[PDB]
Design a protein around this nucleic acid. Structure first.
Ligand SMILES: [Zn+2]
Ligand SMILES: [Zn+2]
Lengths: 97, 38, 337, 102, 123, 145, 131, 124, 48
RNA sequence: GUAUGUAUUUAUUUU
RNA sequence: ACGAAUCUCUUUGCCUUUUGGCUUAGAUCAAGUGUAGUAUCUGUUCUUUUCA
RNA sequence: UUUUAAGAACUAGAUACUAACAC
């Protein structure tokens, strides 16, 4: 009894969270292989964006969260951006296949 | 989840906000004029 | 650079006079956290305290005039109007409570800080309070209608002292992120920073004439001129820290309180530090409780007022014997900065 | 003995990567401008596409070897000491900080 | 180029200016001056307070207190006539209470300019 | 009254909403800014940098020191930098007399019986009995020495 | 795990919401800003990484390792000029710390480019730094 | 105050041709269609007899950054849509210049304040 | 109009200005439905 | 005896 | 010979997933009953390999 | 290039946590 008691430090709330979060992950996995088996039928069903809570709620994926233009500068990068775009279009364009 | 604060809320985070327009109580005009020393 | 060092063996500063202990006034039961004295008649302290009272002592006699109580939490700060018969005292409950002396009663509660308020000062010629504190913003309270007309933005930390000055830059303020901003109110924003201090800037003071601001630090006490925001001098200060307070004077004596219990007086022009004193802590105190929490100089220039964490006020006197006779202090050996 | 100031340390590391850089150049002997814009305040420097890649690769491999020192250090350090009571991982960690004390 | 690189900081700002001469003087800010800063402030404030009272909703606060358009070149002239409310309807039809975070926008930097062996024993 | 109620049904309530100190929520304030105003000083006696963990953990030493001084624990932490230990002694004196002082004032509010609140009673017996024993142990010790 | 762009997408959105929650509550805990920047690099998206650092600086500029890692974040993608502009703002922001000057140096030695390190030490001496 | 003080930024075409005009000033008008914050609205009929009343859709903070007539929403100088003007100016040069703008909510609100202008504006 | 604008349609003002809930209240719908010391004071006033 | 929280897609967005 | 470099190991330095508040220690700390869902504690008996 | 579980079958229930369910 005691040897079992010492080994859990949290309290009811934290454990409750452990559960809730795992349940979220089961939800994810399920919804995925939903979409996977629908792709094996070829019909492509888009994933939901989980709504909002507070009316102003942010969807982080969509736009740069708070975009700080890095600086001015003397050294005129301006070329490295093209190596970037080449690599980024390159990467994402890969993953699609 | 009780955490000792390490900080305080910068006035700035407030400062950007737009106003309200609510009128509270203690702001009703009183002692409407000052007094000066000789 | 050696030229710079030869010059510093020339000017050979400005004999000033020693100091000593005239009077000890007990009678607070807390720490004594602020002092400010009449702009006019020099009869009376006003003494903050950590039991939340404010007692008004009597300068000459040392007896107790009165008690202005009426705060919840401790009073950090006091300022006294020149032109008005007011007293703005501010504590940590997030409140600037105007006073009126004529009847010895409260009048206006100014209001609006997110959190406790560590400094008041009274804009000298415009009829405006300036306040600020752990919110890290420096508010200009308009006096009569209690609107926080201007909210000055600012630092990254608690704001330890605000100084108001009559002409441009009008508010001068220093923050435990280790800078001193210099503010231009009408435009609405910082007109300069003076960055040098390597830690919090825990006091300032205004040359009663020359129009400059001594800026303390923890361990090494610089000065600054306004307009350009020069560096000017560096008062030769080993690490004696920590610096609780700055007090300039009419004779350009300078005070600075230590928390190790050491008063450090300077010449102003030089940096020559010409007296240091252990402040004999007290009867039953605990050696940590020797410190100095506040200072000011009366309007004559000749008499010193400081509180001490051991629950008492001390008043120091300028000892006239002095001259050269055997006066001299540490005898001017500018060293390698 | 002892603790090194964050100054002298940065110098010493500067020396170590000096001599390492020297093994790069010299070993590359063993195995064998600045333009400004009058139009805008931008400046334009021309560098070999060489030695930029040696630079980056060097950095990556440094991050590697350090990362691996830390990892193997995890393994060994957490396997060795068997004395004090441990409820969980962080008892072993912190408690070995209290052993680091004296 | 040695100016191009580090361009901001420079040594004349670490150099204390009363070491050369003591007695170097900065004049107390006169009289015919302080009555200027006092002026531009005092006016500007009275316009602040005059505003913030005339925002709000005390019908009784009012007691306590332009052609302005050349547009383009003025080309079409103008006169700007405020619209009398309908006093019951909201005043400031669009005012509201929202919350923003704001861009801290600057070009330039504030060089922080100052001046582990025996000490970590102690501390 | 209703002027408000309607601007709240349009413009949404006030976004900031500071508050004030008051009767009940006092202590959390007084505490809160006490400890903040240790953490300056102890942050500035350290020579250079090392802060965050060192700081917070030294505060944990703060509290531990206080609730020692309740339980009367003579509180010698075996070794520790002398000046910091000075700070702890300093403040714990300060908060101490906040405590004793409040215990007097209230006890002599009950004695007149003018409307002291409910829990304020139970508490005040707490602060008292603590004080009573401290007096005790003193009195015995000096009966030894 | 991942199938196509759209699954990677949700795996991003979830992370970003989570982390920037944890940064939303603590402006401090710099290691969190670091780790989150690191994730942002492993997504091969720099622009967001640049921002996330910049904000991470506006929180605190006196914490160097964030300067450093915001250098190496620019170099490890083999893009230099940003790792220069960053250095002008760096040494100018903190002349009194060594590690910036030394690192900018080494960046110019492994490039062999001398004219810099000449003018560079010209400044870094001209300020009377030390021995 | 200052809300007034950057003044209207208005077309010289759509504004209509007449010699002198009257237009209201309403201190807190609509929010922007864009930044979603208050501003001062200017009504007017173009000429006096007109049927329809011009309204102005955006800030003077917002119609600065993009440099567009607050009623029109053309360019000020070229009388042209955004998604044209910065397309043309994308062409010459070669590839650049679009303005990626603001989904979510306080993303757009926030991004409104910073003054960098925007690609279409950058030259003009 | 004030009421139905708070989204309470289940409070009823009769023509003597009593306020009665017509649908026994889910607790949340009580909390959202407490009304104001004003609006109650003024209800009464009209009643007179 | 309960507050509290969660999901509730129907009307086919071009290869 | 020693200069230089890679790997491996030991030591030291730096601590890397390394205790995050307050109030009266926050207060309080056992005597019940039948059945039921679910966790788990022990015994016995037998047999020690590969390919399509 | 990684890996290997002793395996199978049989058995009762004691201490358990809790139950808007039964004085
Ligand atoms: Zn137009
Ligand atoms: Zn706008």
């Amino acid at each position: 009894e005691a040897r079992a008691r010492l080994l859990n430090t949290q309290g009811k709330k934290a454990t409750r969270k452990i559960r809730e979060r795992m349940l979220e992950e089961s939800k994810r996995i399920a919804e995925l292989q939903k979409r996977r088996e629908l792709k094996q039928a070829g019909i492509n069903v888009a994933i939901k964006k989980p709504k909002k809570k507070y009316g102003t709620d942010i969807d982080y994926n969509e736009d740069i969260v708070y975009e700080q233009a890095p600086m001015p500068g003397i050294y005129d990068t301006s070329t490295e951006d093209r190596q970037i775009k080449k690599k980024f279009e390159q990467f994402e364009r890969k993953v699609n296949r | 989840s009780h955490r000792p604060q390490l900080e305080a809320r910068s006035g700035a985070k407030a400062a950007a906000y737009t106003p309200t327009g609510i009128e509270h109580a203690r702001l009703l005009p009183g002692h409407t004029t000052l007094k000066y020393r000789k | 650079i050696v030229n710079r060092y030869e010059k510093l063996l020339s000017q050979r500063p400005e004999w000033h006079a020693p100091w000593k202990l005239s009077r000890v006034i007990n009678g607070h039961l807390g720490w004594v956290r602020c002092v400010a004295i009449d702009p006019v008649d020099n009869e009376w302290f006003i003494t903050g305290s950590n039991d939340t009272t404010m007692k008004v002592w009597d300068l000459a006699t040392g007896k107790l005039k009165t008690t202005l109580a009426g705060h919840v939490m401790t009073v950090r700060d006091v300022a006294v109007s020149d032109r008005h018969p007011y007293l703005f005292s501010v504590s940590e409950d997030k409140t600037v409570k105007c006073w009126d002396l004529e009847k010895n009663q409260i009048i206006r509660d100014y209001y609006g800080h997110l959190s406790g308020v560590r400094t008041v000062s009274i804009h000298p010629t415009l009829d405006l309070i300036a306040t600020a504190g752990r919110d890290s913003v420096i508010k200009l309270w308009d006096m009569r209608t209690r609107i926080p007309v201007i909210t000055l933005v600012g630092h990254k930390g608690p704001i330890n002292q605000v100084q108001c000055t009559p002409v441009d830059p009008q508010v001068v303020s220093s923050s435990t992120d280790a800078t001193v901003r210099l503010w231009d109110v009408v435009a609405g924003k910082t007109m300069k920073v003076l960055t040098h201090h390597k830690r919090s800037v825990r006091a300032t003071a205004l040359h009663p004439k020359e129009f400059s601001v001594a800026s303390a630090c923890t361990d090494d006490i610089r000065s600054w001129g306004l307009a350009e925001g020069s560096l000017l001098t560096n008062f030769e200060s080993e690490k004696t820290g920590i610096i609780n307070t700055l007090s300039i004077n009419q004779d350009d004596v300078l005070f600075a309180g230590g928390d190790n219990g050491v008063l450090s007086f300077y010449d102003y022009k030089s940096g020559h530090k010409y007296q240091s004193l252990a402040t004999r802590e007290m009867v039953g105190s605990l050696e940590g409780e020797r410190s100095v929490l506040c200072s000011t100089f009366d309007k004559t220039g000749l008499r010193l007022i400081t509180g001490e964490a051991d629950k008492s006020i001390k008043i120091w006197k300028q000892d006239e014997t002095a001259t050269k006779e055997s006066e001299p202090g540490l005898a001017w050996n500018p060293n390698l900065s | 003995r002892g603790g090194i100031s964050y100054d002298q340390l940065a110098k010493l590391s500067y020396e170590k990567t000096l001599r390492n850089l020297a093994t790069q150049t010299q070993n590359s002997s063993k195995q064998d401008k600045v333009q400004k814009d009058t139009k805008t305040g931008k400046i334009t420097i021309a560098d070999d596409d060489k030695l930029v890649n040696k630079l980056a690769v060097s950095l990556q491999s440094e991050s590697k070897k350090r990362y691996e020192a830390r990892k193997r250090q995890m393994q060994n350090a957490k396997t060795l000491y068997g004395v004090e009571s441990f409820i969980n991982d962080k008892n072993k960690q912190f408690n070995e900080k209290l052993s680091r004390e004296s | 180029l040695t100016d191009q690189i580090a361009k901001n900081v420079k040594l004349d700002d670490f150099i204390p200016k009363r070491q050369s001469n003591f007695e170097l003087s900065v004049p107390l800010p006169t009289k015919a001056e302080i009555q200027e800063c006092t002026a531009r402030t005092k006016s500007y404030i009275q316009r602040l307070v005059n505003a913030k009272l005339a925002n709000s909703n005390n019908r009784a606060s009012s007691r306590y207190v332009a052609p302005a358009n050349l547009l383009l070149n003025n080309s079409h002239h103008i006169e700007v006539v405020s619209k009398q409310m309908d006093p019951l309807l909201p005043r400031f039809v669009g005012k509201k209470a929202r919350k923003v975070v704001a861009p801290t926008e600057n070009d330039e930097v504030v060089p922080v300019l100052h001046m582990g062996e025996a000490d970590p024993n102690e501390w | 009254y209703i002027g408000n109620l309607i601007t709240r049904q349009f413009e949404g309530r006030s976004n900031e909403i500071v508050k004030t100190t008051t009767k009940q929520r006092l202590d959390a304030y007084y505490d809160l800014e006490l400890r903040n105003s240790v953490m300056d000083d102890i942050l500035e006696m350290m020579p250079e940098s090392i802060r965050q963990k060192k700081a917070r953990t030294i505060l944990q030493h703060l509290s531990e020191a206080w609730r020692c001084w309740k339980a009367n624990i003579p509180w010698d932490v075996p070794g520790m930098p002398a000046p910091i230990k000075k700070i702890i002694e300093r403040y714990i004196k300060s908060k101490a007399d906040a405590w004793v002082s409040a215990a007097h004032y209230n006890r002599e509010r009950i004695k007149r019986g003018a409307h002291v609140e409910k829990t304020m009673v139970k508490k005040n017996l707490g602060r008292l009995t603590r004080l009573w024993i401290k007096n005790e142990q003193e009195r015995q010790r000096q009966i030894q020495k | 795990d991942i199938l196509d762009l759209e699954e990677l997408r949700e795996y991003q959105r979830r992370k970003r919401t989570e982390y920037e929650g944890y940064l939303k509550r603590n402006r401090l805990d710099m290691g969190q800003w670091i780790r989150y920047a690191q994730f942002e690099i492993e997504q091969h998206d720099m622009r967001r990484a640049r921002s996330i650092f910049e904000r991470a600086l506006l929180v605190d500029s006196s914490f160097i390792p964030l300067w450093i890692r915001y250098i190496d974040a620019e170099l490890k993608v083999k893009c230099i000029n940003h790792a220069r502009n960053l250095m002008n703002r760096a040494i100018s922001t903190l002349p009194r710390v060594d590690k910036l000057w030394y690192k900018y140096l080494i960046v110019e030695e492994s490039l062999n480019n001398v004219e810099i390190v000449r003018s560079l030490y010209t400044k870094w001496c001209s300020l009377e730094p030390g021995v | 105050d200052e809300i007034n003080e950057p003044p209207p930024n208005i077309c010289e075409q759509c504004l209509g041709d007449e010699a002198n005009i009257r237009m209201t000033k309403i201190p807190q008008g609509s929010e922007c269609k864009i930044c979603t914050l208050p501003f001062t609205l200017y009504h007017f009929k173009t000429s006096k007899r007109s049927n329809n009343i011009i309204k102005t859709l955006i800030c003077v903070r917002c119609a600065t950054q993009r440099n567009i007539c607050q009623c029109c929403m053309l360019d000020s100088r070229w009388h042209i849509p955004i998604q044209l003007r910065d397309h043309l100016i994308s062409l010459v040069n070669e590839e650049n210049v679009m303005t990626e703008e603001a989904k979510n909510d306080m993303m757009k609100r926030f991004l409104s304040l910073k003054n960098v202008k925007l690609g279409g504006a950058q030259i003009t | 109009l004030l009421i139905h604008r708070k989204g309470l349609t289940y409070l009823h003002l009769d023509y003597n200005f009593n306020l009665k809930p017509t649908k026994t209240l889910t607790t949340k719908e009580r909390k959202k439905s407490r009304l104001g010391n004003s609006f109650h004071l003024m209800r009464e006033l009209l009643k007179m």
